[PDB]
Design a binder for this molecule. Structure first.
Ligand SMILES: CCn1c(-c2nonc2N)nc2c(C#CC(C)(C)O)nc(OC[C@H](N)Cc3ccccc3)cc21
Lengths: 321, 10
């Protein structure tokens, strides 16, 4: 059984209200990983056990170049630990915040890798439900790594539906802001928002009041910069179609609609998945412990330490299963 | 640059 003191703890990469994520060195190999450490007490109190269990179980079987690979999943008496591959390039949120906007070409490169990963997940009857800039990360080479599978749902094929009101406010598809159930098209809306941000340099809809924000998502027309290309406008219009049945990717072919769209005219999708494409930006990391593409807000912080209490789908190892 | 968003459930 794997435990806490099997790792060195180096720097805080991100912090949440459930727990924290830390850069660690595996003592027995000397290799570097990211570790997400959640507190069981907070999870149980929020009744978010199924979701946290889902996150591990989905990671235990998924394999794709643009999904973060899980090395270990273990637990202590009061903590849950995910140990995954360290994305040296940091969050896409960090980069877009620093650069303000990406070119259509650069956005096309990232979008193609997100689409490839979404096709894969949807083919496995998995709906990701939380596509956003914070959950898209770059590895050392500059390829996309989707992270955070805490709001995944399984067993969702064709027009299967879901009932949990969850996601991230600013990224919620309009149908999720209605009563009753919604389908897997919400992921393609999610893509739409990140595509929109990458090319237009802001969220398509925003207000710090959620009541105001949810009204915008349901009621407001998206606007485009004039200089944006027609196929860029067409893609964003299609992905951000308020009606999921008319939305690009919302049909029975799922990812094929998005893949065949004219915005991706110059993309070979087999080249994408095989990593034959060259990242436009390459992280300039000078060592394994280099955390330049993470925020000082987190990395400057020092690292303190704040019966059958067992979670029944954890204790995983990539070497064993 | 927008502020950090936070995920939620039910
Ligand atoms: C710090 C950036 N970061 C990284 C990471 N950065 O470098 N290499 C990496 N793998 N992985 C992250 C994961 C993940 C994951 C798995 C286990 C693969 O699903 N979740 C994040 O956030 C979740 C949530 N949105 C807010 C949060 C944050 C902290 C505690 C609790 C909740 C952030 C992550």
């Amino acid at each position: 059984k794997v435990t806490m003191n099997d790792f060195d703890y180096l720097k805080l990469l991100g912090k949440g209200t459930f727990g924290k994520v830390i850069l660690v060195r595996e003592k027995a190999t000397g290799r570097y990983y990211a570790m997400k450490i959640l507190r069981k007490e907070v999870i149980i109190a929020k009744d978010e056990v199924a979701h946290t269990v889902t996150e591990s179980r989905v990671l235990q079987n998924t394999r794709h170049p643009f999904l973060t690979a899980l090395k270990y999943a273990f637990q202590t008496h009061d903590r849950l630990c995910f140990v995954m591959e360290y994305a040296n390039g940091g969050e896409l949120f960090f980069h877009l915040s620093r650069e303000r906007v990406f070119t259509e070409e650069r956005a096309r490169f990232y979008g193609a890798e997100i689409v490839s990963a979404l096709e894969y997940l949807h083919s496995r009857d998995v709906v990701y439900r939380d596509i956003k800039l914070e959950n898209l990360m770059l590895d050392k080479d500059g390829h996309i790594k989707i992270t955070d599978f805490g709001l995944c749902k399984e067993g969702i094929s064709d027009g299967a539906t879901m009932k949990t009101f969850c996601g991230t406010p600013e990224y919620l598809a309009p149908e999720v802001l209605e009563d009753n159930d919604y389908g897997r098209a919400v992921d393609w809306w999610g893509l739409g928002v990140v595509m929109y941000e990458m090319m237009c340099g802001r969220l398509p809809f925003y207000n710090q009041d959620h009541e105001r924000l949810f009204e915008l998502i349901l009621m407001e027309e998206i606007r485009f910069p004039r200089t944006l290309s027609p196929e860029a406008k067409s893609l964003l219009a299609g992905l951000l179609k308020k009606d999921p049945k008319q939305r690009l990717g919302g049909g029975p072919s799922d990812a094929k609609e998005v893949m065949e769209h004219r915005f991706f005219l110059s993309i070979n999708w087999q080249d994408v998945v095989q990593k034959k494409l060259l990242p436009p930006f390459k992280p300039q990391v000078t060592s394994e412990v280099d955390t330049r593409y993470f925020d000082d807000e987190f990395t400057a912080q020092s690292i303190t330490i704040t019966q059958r209490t067992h979670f029944p789908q954890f204790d995983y190892s990539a070497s064993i299963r | 640059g927008r502020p950090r968003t936070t995920s939620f459930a039910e």
